[PDB]
Design a binder for this molecule. Structure first.
Ligand code: ZN
Ligand code: ZN
Ligand code: ZN
Ligand code: ZN
Length: 1271
RNA sequence: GACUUAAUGUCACGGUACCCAAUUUUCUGCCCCGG
């Protein structure tokens, strides 16, 4: 008649449910599913606090199962006393049914006890069950119980007032995933409780018989699992912060709304979250980025005024008032509040069905054979992340335990209470179920409402496997990864399509415990373990987690050890050592001499090459394709959040990662550069969908097209999985990142647009030192020949260079030069992977042709005036497919310098090292990446775009409107002086001009791409004798262009575009270098290196989906004939920078045809293309008087082409005697270098006495007209 | 103690928060007349 005080300790997070009695339980679903959990009852009016307990019937059922298993292991005999096989049935007519009904099978044995159990003398099993006693099924009192299990209360160490549910539990949503489609069918909710603080329960067991006492104390140690967690049973003797931060976030959102800058709030939200990865000093020591050289606007977003103050000072005064909650929680709370306010402003469940019907109430005895041996195996090891991982969870403030009742774009990761990463038990068990079903070949879909247990092989083996949840030793914050969408018609982004996820680092380690109780170790479980384990040669293939299409959640199994318990002979040592539950960490570090007795190492573990479920069902499941991209251009994959946080006022930086190391225990100090898996997943998807023509469909629900079979949709998972492209040779570079700055040039003034300068920081890729990125993807088994051909054609299209990586690909960034494929790829993928002259001589102007003694003086820039008519096409050519009637290919071109050329590297303003003395003197070098002279692609693109726009009467694409003239003030601004048709194109509703249709706009991608030019041949470095380097001429003064000379009254609107003349005026700069370096201030001059005439550069132009006349006009704009050339670079009024482009080759491909080939496009078809372009220009003019035939075209029959080609005429080309004199005037008769009695000042060309304003505009409009003796 | 179980019968270690979506489109580091 003695009592036993028992203590129950958990080692995993257990499950919690609400308490109802018996009938309110049947009214509910979550309570009926939630039996055999830990119950929770409320306390007091209002549902905030209560207490948790575990009922005595649950502990009774666990002990009864343990007694039955222990008596089955010893054939119905414990410590030499025999016992019968109990009773587990109740007749319905005599008494009621016992409130819980068994569906599982009960173990039996042969009764060899030689008696029959009655009230007087009973076996130990019948005493422990409670058959022959009083108080059955209707409770009266605690006495007349032979064995009594009391309730188990939470042994709260700090039980002072109450326990809140949000302090013990945390809600979570589980899932059910179909095997074939990979999509969810239904979901349900649970409550998981903490075990480190609230995991000890205490209770009392009362007994009135000692024959039961020996077996009961033996069987309390064999209970291994209760309420969803591994257990051990022993016998002993800040809402105010959220409210204040919510009101402050409302103030921030309204202040952004008043400036009409609401869309930035989303950006700002994640920026604050990224601030958890740096210290608090980035707010305390004002290390946030500032803007460029403009005091007015300040920064792009950190200087938006909120209640009269900037955002950085508001952040400082908010952090100064919430110092107690820590830095990380402060940043997360502010970011989550801003995201929820933005989402508010912008704007199924299945539990196991009831069985109250006929059904079945059966009894299934199973008696195992006598000579069997039952053993228990334990596998211990570590799990190491090979990729980033993601374990999804619901949003906080949507999963709060007490209250449960527009899709989100932000997603979070699963963490513990101490902010540690967590592989839950359910995810590991689901992945083990999936791989075991693949290993067996056949299994069932899981049925929930069941009266008979499933008899498939997977469900047989999964009822003997016990796992354990894992947590790491890492607490550092996650990273945020971003994804967008792309409109396939315009090749731009779609608004409202941005979303982000939270990922953890690669290299992290987690513990791993598995237990299996049975008669023999299965072949299929060992095959799955060997499929998960990594060795030399083989990599791991454990796909846990939930973003596997992007390659997130590939783990490996390191350091496996398998131990074995013999339960038929050493059951007492198992009972004593409690199965090493909770001490599995010590098994990995124990030697073989310190093991407990009864646990031996298991040496008959099957090797990889002898397992038969391996090599037939698991290894051919996924096939690997590894490759190496060789990129010979600057590569820029933008970050857009790191640029807002790291100090150094950069605009676009490259993408980085964080990799955890395991030799030491911290993250690696230097980060790794990579191209994300999402980016080249989208590259492959667009590359397949353009050739098959499936991107044009507007809907993809209930589809079965090719890109929905390979890449999946909303109803099936993908058969192709991508990984990142990491840089492998970024250590043989010096200064891997390179600073490149660009600007926009106004078309009327010829100078830079005010505040349009931007800068990029791409990685230094050169054609003689290229970047090498290593990548890999996985293909599922079951692919046909056509789908393999589609993927291989996409790989060959990446290799040929149609899809550049990253941003700014139209100006030459991220051009793939090659692809190499290693020897481990299967043989099908390896075997499927493996003069022009224009001859058009323009008759030049007769005024610098009839003089021929060089006495005239001309003006160095003139203006072109095509009047008002622009043609805006409303049917835009789309990027969705490769159309059959259109053209696509590449042009290889060469560039030759007729005059010296200056292309500066404007990063360093002291690169020739001359500012030690003469401080404030800008001096530059030539443009180079890694010591190789290059010309950027943006310069060539802007030159050709200005020529194409002036040829075809296009709009002014880059134009300054806010500036106002003043001579006396003025009337409306110089944006209002322009005609309405010449304004820049905005939107696709009103159409597009020819220049904006070919080269692009903000809402439509261009169809031409210009590459970087490389130097290859000829001399270099025009040498001057007396100079501090032998290179590096010192230039003159290059002052800002003044538009008041061309509009000299309130009338007389804008005189068109501005072009410069070709002359050898650099000779007089080269001669008087001593006159230049003395007597002009060094803050006004620029010193820079020059290249001589005769150097050859080479570059490529790439185009897709062009009509015939567009390619004709492009080939005409590249090489417009003899005696016509272009202007490029610095110092164009002084004569520097005349280039001539020769077309070396033209290739055109047609990939909608039978075979994808590359032609050579002979001379006859090129002449036909230029002729078609000329006929299109005549049709746009309207003059039908010019006949149609096979005559070589005379472009000077159109007036504006004649003016344009007079402006670009090179007179000194064919070794003729003439070279004109081109120079600006010199203010007054005393200024600098006046020439006696020439009268070439601005004092005489300025007033309305020597020439009125009309003839001045007349002289600035007509090309090459002499200005000395004025005519 | 009660709050808070019923007792000859609890496979909820009977269920992967899973699935689809390229941070990108456009822009020549350029340039002479007065205060
Ligand atoms: Zn008995
Ligand atoms: Zn099954
Ligand atoms: Zn489809
Ligand atoms: Zn336009």
């Amino acid at each position: 008649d003695m009592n036993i005080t028992v203590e129950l300790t958990f080692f995993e997070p257990y499950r919690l449910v609400e308490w109802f009695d018996w009938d309110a339980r049947k009214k509910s679903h979550s309570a009926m599913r939630g039996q055999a959990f830990a119950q929770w009852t409320w306390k007091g009016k209002g549902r905030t606090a209560g207490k948790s307990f575990i009922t005595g019937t649950l502990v009774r059922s666990a002990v009864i199962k343990a007694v039955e298993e222990l008596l089955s292991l010893n054939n119905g005999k414990w410590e030499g006393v025999p016992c019968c096989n109990g009773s587990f049935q109740t007749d319905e007519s005599k008494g009621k049914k016992p409130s819980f009904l068994r569906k599982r099978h009960t173990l039996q044995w042969q009764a060899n006890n030689k008696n029959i159990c009655d009230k007087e003398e009973a076996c130990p099993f019948c005493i422990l069950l409670g058959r022959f006693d009083n108080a059955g099924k209707v409770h009266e009192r605690n006495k007349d119980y032979d064995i009594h299990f009391s309730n188990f209360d939470l042994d709260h160490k700090q039980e002072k007032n109450d326990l809140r549910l949000v302090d013990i539990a945390s809600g979570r949503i589980l899932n059910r995933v179909d095997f074939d489609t990979g999509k969810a069918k239904d979901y349900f909710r649970t409550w998981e409780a903490d075990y480190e603080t609230y995991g000890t329960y205490t209770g009392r067991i009362t007994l009135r018989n000692e024959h039961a006492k020996k077996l009961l104390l033996a069987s309390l140690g064999f209970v291994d699992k209760l309420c969803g967690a591994l257990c051990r049973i022993e016998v002993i003797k800040s809402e105010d912060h959220n409210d204040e931060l919510r009101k402050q976030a409302e103030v921030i959102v309204e202040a952004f709304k008043q400036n009409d800058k609401l869309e930035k709030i989303r950006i700002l939200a994640d920026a604050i979250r990224t601030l958890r990865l740096h210290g608090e000093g980035v707010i305390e020591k004002d290390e946030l980025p500032d803007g460029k050289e403009e005091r007015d606007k300040g920064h792009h977003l950190w200087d938006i005024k909120v209640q009269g103050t900037a955002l950085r000072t508001k952040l400082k005064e908010l952090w100064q008032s919430n110092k107690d909650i820590g830095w990380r929680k402060f940043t997360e709370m502010l970011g989550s509040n801003l995201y929820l306010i933005y989402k508010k402003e912008t704007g199924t469940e299945y539990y196991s069905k009831a069985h109250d019907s006929e059904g079945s109430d059966l009894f299934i005895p199973v008696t195992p054979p006598e000579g069997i041996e039952t053993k228990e195996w334990i596998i211990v090891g570590r799990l190491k992340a090979a990729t980033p991982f993601y374990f999804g969870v619901q949003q906080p403030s949507d999963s709060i335990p007490g209250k449960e009742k527009n899709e989100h774009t932000s997603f979070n990761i699963l963490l513990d209470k101490e902010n540690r990463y967590r592989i839950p038990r359910s995810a590991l068990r689901g992945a083990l179920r999936r791989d075991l079903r693949t290993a067996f070949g056949s299994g069932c879909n899981v049925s929930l409402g069941g009266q008979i247990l499933c008899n498939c092989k997977v469900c047989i083996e999964m009822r003997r496997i016990t796992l354990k949840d894992s947590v790491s030793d890492f607490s550092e914050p996650p990273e945020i990864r971003y994804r967008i969408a792309k409109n396939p018609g315009t090749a731009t982004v779609e608004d409202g399509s941005l979303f982000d996820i939270e990922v953890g680092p690669e290299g992290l380690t987690f513990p791993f415990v598995l237990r299996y109780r049975g008669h023999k170790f299965p072949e299929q479980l060992s095959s799955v373990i060997r499929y998960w384990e990594e060795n030399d040669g083989k990599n791991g293939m454990a796909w846990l987690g939930g973003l596997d299409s992007t390659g997130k959640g590939r783990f490996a199994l390191k350091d496996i050890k398998i131990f074995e318990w013999d339960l038929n002979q050493k059951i007492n040592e198992y009972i004593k050592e409690r199965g090493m539950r909770g001490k599995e960490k010590e098994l990995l570090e124990m030697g073989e001499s310190s093991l407990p007795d009864g646990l031996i190492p298991y040496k008959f573990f099957e090797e990889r090459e002898c397992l038969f479920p391996y090599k037939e069902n698991l290894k051919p499941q996924w096939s690997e394709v590894q490759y190496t991209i060789e990129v010979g251009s600057p590569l820029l994959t933008a970050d857009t959040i790191s640029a807002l946080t790291e100090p150094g006022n950069r605009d676009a930086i490259a993408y980085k990662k964080r990799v955890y190391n395991d030799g030491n225990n911290a993250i690696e100090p230097e980060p790794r550069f990579a191209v994300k898996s999402e980016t080249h997943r989208g590259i492959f998807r667009t590359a397949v969908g353009r050739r098959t023509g499936d991107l044009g469909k507007e809907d993809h629900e209930d589809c079965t097209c090719d890109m929905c079979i390979i890449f999946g949709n909303e109803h099936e998972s993908s058969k192709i999985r991508f990984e990142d492209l990491e840089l492998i040779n970024g250590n043989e570079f010096e200064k891997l990142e390179k600073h490149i700055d660009h600007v926009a040039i106004d078309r009327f003034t010829g100078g830079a647009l005010d505040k349009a300068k931007f800068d990029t920081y791409p990685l230094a890729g050169s054609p003689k030192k290229p970047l090498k990125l290593k990548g890999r993807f996985w293909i599922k088994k079951g692919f046909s020949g056509d789908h393999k051909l589609l993927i291989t054609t996409a790989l060959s299209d990446i290799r040929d260079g149609l899809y550049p990586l990253g941003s700014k690909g139209g100006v030459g960034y991220g051009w793939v030069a090659g692809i190499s494929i290693d020897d481990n790829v299967p043989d099908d993928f390896k075997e499927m992977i493996n003069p022009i002259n224009n001859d058009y001589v323009h008759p030049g102007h007769q005024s610098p042709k009839q003089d021929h003694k060089n006495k005239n003086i001309y003006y160095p820039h003139y203006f072109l005036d095509s009047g008002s008519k622009v043609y805006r096409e409303k049917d835009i050519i789309t990027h969705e497919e490769f159309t059959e009637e259109l053209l696509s290919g590449k042009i290889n071109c060469k560039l030759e310098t007729l005059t010296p050329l200056i292309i500066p590297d404007t990063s360093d303003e002291n690169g020739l090292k001359l500012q030690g003395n003469k401080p404030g003197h800008k001096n530059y070098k030539f443009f180079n990446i890694n010591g190789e002279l290059m010309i950027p692609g943006s310069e060539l693109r802007g030159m050709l775009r200005t020529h194409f726009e002036a040829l075809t009467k296009s709009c002014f694409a880059i134009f300054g409107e806010d500036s106002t003239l003043s001579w006396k003030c003025a009337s409306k601004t110089l944006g209002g002086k322009l005609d309405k048709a010449l304004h820049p194109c905005t939107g696709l509703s009103d159409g597009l001009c020819p220049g904006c249709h070919l080269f692009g706009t903000t809402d439509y991608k261009g169809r031409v791409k210009f590459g970087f030019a490389k130097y290859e041949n000829g001399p270099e470095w025009l040498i001057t004798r007396g100079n501090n380097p032998e290179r590096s001429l010192t230039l003159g003064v290059l002052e800002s262009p003044r538009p008041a000379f061309s509009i000299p009254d309130d009338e007389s609107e804008i005189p068109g575009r501005k072009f410069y003349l070709h002359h050898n005026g650099w000779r007089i700069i080269r001669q008087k270098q001593l006159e230049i370096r003395e007597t002009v201030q060094p803050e006004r001059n620029v010193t820079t290196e020059v290249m001589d005439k005769g150097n050859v550069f080479s570059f490529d132009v790439r185009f897709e989906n062009l009509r015939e006349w567009e390619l004709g006009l492009l080939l005409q704009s590249l090489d417009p004939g003899k005696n016509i050339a272009h202007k490029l670079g610095k110092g164009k009024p002084y004569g520097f920078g005349s280039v001539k482009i020769k077309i070396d080759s033209l290739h055109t491909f047609k990939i909608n045809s039978n075979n994808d080939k590359i032609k050579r496009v002979p001379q006859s078809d090129i002449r036909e293309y230029i002729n078609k372009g000329y006929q299109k220009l005549i049709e746009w003019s309207g003059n039908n008087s010019i006949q149609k035939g096979n005559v070589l075209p005379q472009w000077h029959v159109i007036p504006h082409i004649d003016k344009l080609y007079k402006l670009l005429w090179v007179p000194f080309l064919n070794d003729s005697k003439l070279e004109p004199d081109v120079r600006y005037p010199v203010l007054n008769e005393e200024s600098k270098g006046y020439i006696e009695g020439s009268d070439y000042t601005y004092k005489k060309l300025g007033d309305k006495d020597n020439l009125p304003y009309k003839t001045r505009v007349k002289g600035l409009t007509t090309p090459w007209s002499p200005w000395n003796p004025f005519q």
